[PDB]
Amino acid sequence: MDVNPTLLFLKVPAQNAISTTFPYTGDPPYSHGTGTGYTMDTVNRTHQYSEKGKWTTNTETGAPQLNPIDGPLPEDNEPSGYAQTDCVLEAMAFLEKSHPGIFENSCLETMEIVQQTRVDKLTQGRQTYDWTLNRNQPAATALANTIEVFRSNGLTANESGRLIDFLKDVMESMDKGEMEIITHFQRKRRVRDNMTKKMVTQRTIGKKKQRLNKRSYLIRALTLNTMTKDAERGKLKRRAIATPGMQIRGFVYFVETLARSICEKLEQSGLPVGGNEKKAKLANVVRKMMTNSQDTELSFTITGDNTKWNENQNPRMFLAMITYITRNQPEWFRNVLSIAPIMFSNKMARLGKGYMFESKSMKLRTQIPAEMLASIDLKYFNESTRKKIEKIRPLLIDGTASLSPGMMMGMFNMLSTVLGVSILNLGQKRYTKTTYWWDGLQSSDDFALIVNAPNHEGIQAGVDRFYRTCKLVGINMSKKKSYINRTGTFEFTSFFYRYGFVANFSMELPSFGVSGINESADMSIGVTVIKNNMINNDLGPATAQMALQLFIKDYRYTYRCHRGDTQIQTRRSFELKKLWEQTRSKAGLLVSDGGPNLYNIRNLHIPEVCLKWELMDEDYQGRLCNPLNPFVSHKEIESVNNAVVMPAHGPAKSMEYDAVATTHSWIPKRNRSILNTSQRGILEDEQMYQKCCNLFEKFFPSSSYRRPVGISSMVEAMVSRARIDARIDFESGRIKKEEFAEIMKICSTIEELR
Amino acid sequence: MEDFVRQCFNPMIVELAEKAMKEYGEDPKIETNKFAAICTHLEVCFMYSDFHFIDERGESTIIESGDPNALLKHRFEIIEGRDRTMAWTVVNSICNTTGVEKP
Amino acid sequence: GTFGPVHFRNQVKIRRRVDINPGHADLSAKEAQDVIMEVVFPNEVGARILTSESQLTITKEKKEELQDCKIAPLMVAYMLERELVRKTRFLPVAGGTSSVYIEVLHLTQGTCWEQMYTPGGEVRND
RNA sequence: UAAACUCCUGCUUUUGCU
RNA sequence: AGUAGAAACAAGGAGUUUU
């Protein structure tokens, strides 16, 4: 007979079996080539939905940017970023009138988070865009390259450990024209050999000077790198994700600090937390809308979504918000939050890599950079891409594209959500002064709305009042991907809701397996993922001892460590049996080297070796009790018990895991493609230094537990300790005070080297 | 003046107050008075300290040599002029090897 | 610990920020790192506030326990830090919300069912 | 010039030099 | 050819020798 499984929704309700319609089992779509065609199809789409603002021209930039807000009102259902400043302020002047005193309260923690934060808060995160090398360097090396730009510039003024003078000089860096950056290029030498009398070559790296301008640094200071959103699910196309620059996120950390602090004091943004508080907030307001549930009301919910949510923002009304939610605040504080919506409203996206061309005659390929797109024989392109260049060939400045309207992904959330919930604030009945009233929630772009009114004519008059309210601020709800129905059935970032009881089925299971960080610490996080998702993401009992049963089956395939009772063969089987026949504790031996699987769903929270400890005979764990451990390299507190495992709710999330230090917690291999780049000199200089920076960090005890923040000059820094190491050993100690004089003698001998 | 700080003094007190001023954000010396309050104060710190050693018998005297090559030791310990780490490091290093309360 | 039989009752879970393993003395998270900073090596504390009187005895007990461990790494220090961190994580708690019941939280609660669960140890007095 | 052999790399191969 | 899907891979990268 003909078999289809999608007919079992004829019996099971759709929100109870909705996980069958999540193809999260196959691979996600990847972008293959670039994002150059994807960035230009967003700089076009931003300047199409905002096409009627006045085209200014920036003074220090040369950018022909668009100034789209408080322009002509939209007069169709096509989305439009023409936001009304006298309604952005107005719809969140009603944010304080519902929840009183939010803004000056929430600034006051933000005025204290600004007064205790180092620069180290911005060196953690995603890979960023440095401006020195014009490339996605990761978040440490981009920060620790731009700082010695200032040191190789005249004015450092930043080395005081706090980031606000680091956020003073990034404004001041836009004053010094000659920005003498560092360039290193690769050369060769010629040495001899005395043993074999042969004369061979040797590789080394040179040094080169380079300078900038004020129409060349300011672009690179305001440059967003545009990647492609790899491994997004649920979209046939792709999209550009934006990587903010190095200077930008310093100001942006304070802006989302404030803006997250708003949403934790509000109660309709599920975003500042994880998914479990979101299920509370979701099912909160379905009951909050049964507060005024009269004898005859009609309450239709809206399973909303916002289409083109990122292009139809504008950081010019972000500046309108954070000028208003910092009312009567100090002058320095209102200023420092204000730089980030300024340098998003002059931001200049790069155009990615470029395009790969193909000869159908000479059988040759090549690829141009994205910068050559200002000057190309336009018949090199097919008919679709040729349309995309001509609509933004006026916008190419210095290989970038001036994109002042619109945000885009990977840059900033949680303040446009504050905007998006403030319209949902306005449906509170004290503000409507009519029979219809609404409330709901607002995620990043997927919202859910519940409106009520005493007949269908009221709801119809209540839905569009909301829709024409969101049009005043550039929030354009997806008329494709949204619908209305009565209460009890909606979704909200795929948290489906059936009459009261949510089925999660969002970030379903991309992992459930060996997410190899180590060999033990991906079992300790392995059995934690089955543990945590019995709580958070709601998998039941039998699938928890299936996702454990199979977790081990590919824990033993990646790490080859099958049992001895399986007589199958791999790189070792024989000396495992030495552990089998000698240890009287057969069934307590550890499983990262061929043991039984004592785990079940009574004991996931127990770690691996602390589970298998009250059974082992003294030899094995005593062979594991060796604290020398050439296989550990005892980490730092930010990296002790931290793996970066991505959900589908956010860009990244670190989650911890009870991992005992053991010989199986080793660090995996560094990638070696940097050895063949012409960027070798960023490694051979710096590979020698964490050999010896941690030789200093032996001499402080708390340096491997706390950040050491003192004077500069690491060589001068330990000798200040060495002479206070000296006297408390001199006044009292076990060692002789003549060997003290040897400790004395080294100190000036350091200074005898100038 | 800050030129008077640069001229009629020695640069060892100036530069150690250059690092000591680069702590709160007044880095181009726009104060020019707390830049002048501390450089006067730090010159007291060296004139209260130097040309005094600690002998083997324990007597208080002066020695006109002044050439340690890190072989002789002083009697007053320089704490002001160090950083906020290195101050509290030396402060706590006294209170742990003695019976002194912590300030 | 001892298990009870299955009480087949439905799940009406409550999703509240509930504590995970706070441990001893209910000390502040920075103040938790303060007593650890003493016992790792005392000369790096920088604590403008010394301690309260209740911390003055409990750090003296922890002081000799590190020599009682072994010639010990620094990692024995920041696991004593881990039993003092009061973690408060919002979790759907269908049942009791205590730092002895919070580590299981999945063994006990569910779909058609609850699992009655009595872990061993000292049932408290306060 | 066209053929073969020689070393590195498999996320850093997105691009700045001589 | 094939994979693939709005742009890609189908080795990249360094050396030597012969119209």
Short mmCIF file of C-alpha atoms in Angstrom, two decimals, chain A residues 273-277 279-280 531 534-536 538 540-541 601-605 634-635 637 640-641 656-659 661 700-702 704-706 721 728, chain C residues 3 13 15-17 32-33 36-37 40-41 43-46 70-71 73-75 78 81-82 87 89-92 103-107 109 111 113 117:
data_model
loop_
_atom_site.label_atom_id
_atom_site.label_comp_id
_atom_site.label_asym_id
_atom_site.label_seq_id
_atom_site.Cartn_x
_atom_site.Cartn_y
_atom_site.Cartn_z
CA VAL A 273 17.94 34.18 29.08
CA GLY A 274 17.76 30.65 27.71
CA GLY A 275 14.77 28.66 26.59
CA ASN A 276 13.30 27.55 29.92
CA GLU A 277 12.43 31.06 31.05
CA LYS A 279 8.43 28.82 28.15
CA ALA A 280 7.43 30.58 31.35
CA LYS A 531 21.26 15.18 31.22
CA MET A 534 16.01 15.94 29.78
CA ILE A 535 15.31 19.21 31.59
CA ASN A 536 15.73 22.05 29.12
CA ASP A 538 12.62 17.87 27.04
CA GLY A 540 12.04 11.66 27.87
CA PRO A 541 13.40 8.63 29.66
CA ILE A 601 19.63 7.72 33.97
CA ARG A 602 20.19 7.66 37.69
CA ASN A 603 23.69 9.07 37.43
CA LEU A 604 24.40 11.45 34.56
CA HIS A 605 25.34 14.29 36.89
CA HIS A 634 46.17 22.61 33.30
CA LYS A 635 43.97 25.28 31.81
CA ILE A 637 39.38 29.45 34.51
CA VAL A 640 38.44 25.10 32.60
CA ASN A 641 35.07 23.34 32.12
CA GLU A 656 29.91 23.74 31.62
CA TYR A 657 30.37 20.12 32.51
CA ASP A 658 31.63 18.29 35.58
CA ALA A 659 35.00 17.11 34.27
CA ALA A 661 41.18 16.29 35.57
CA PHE A 700 52.88 34.54 40.47
CA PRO A 701 50.58 31.96 42.06
CA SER A 702 47.29 33.69 41.22
CA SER A 704 46.79 31.28 36.41
CA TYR A 705 43.61 31.87 38.44
CA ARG A 706 43.08 35.64 38.28
CA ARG A 721 58.17 40.59 43.23
CA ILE A 728 60.43 37.66 53.58
CA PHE C 3 14.04 5.29 45.36
CA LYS C 13 6.13 22.12 35.90
CA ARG C 15 10.02 27.24 35.76
CA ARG C 16 11.89 29.12 38.46
CA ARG C 17 15.45 30.28 39.08
CA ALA C 32 33.75 33.23 47.61
CA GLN C 33 36.80 34.12 45.53
CA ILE C 36 39.94 31.18 48.00
CA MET C 37 42.41 33.98 47.21
CA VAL C 40 45.85 29.77 47.27
CA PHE C 41 48.56 32.23 48.47
CA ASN C 43 49.76 37.93 49.17
CA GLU C 44 47.37 38.57 46.27
CA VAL C 45 44.10 39.22 48.06
CA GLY C 46 43.64 43.01 47.66
CA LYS C 70 49.34 16.41 48.88
CA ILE C 71 52.06 18.67 47.64
CA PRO C 73 48.51 21.96 42.52
CA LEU C 74 46.63 25.21 42.26
CA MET C 75 43.68 23.22 40.93
CA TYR C 78 39.68 26.46 42.54
CA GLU C 81 35.95 27.68 44.87
CA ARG C 82 33.43 25.59 42.92
CA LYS C 87 24.60 29.00 40.87
CA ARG C 89 19.61 28.38 37.07
CA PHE C 90 16.01 28.56 35.90
CA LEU C 91 14.83 24.99 35.48
CA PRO C 92 11.37 23.45 35.30
CA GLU C 103 21.30 17.90 40.98
CA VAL C 104 19.04 15.05 40.08
CA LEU C 105 15.99 16.98 38.72
CA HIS C 106 15.64 14.53 35.79
CA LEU C 107 15.53 11.27 37.68
CA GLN C 109 10.03 14.29 37.24
CA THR C 111 5.54 12.94 31.50
CA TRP C 113 4.86 10.21 35.98
CA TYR C 117 13.39 9.95 45.18
#
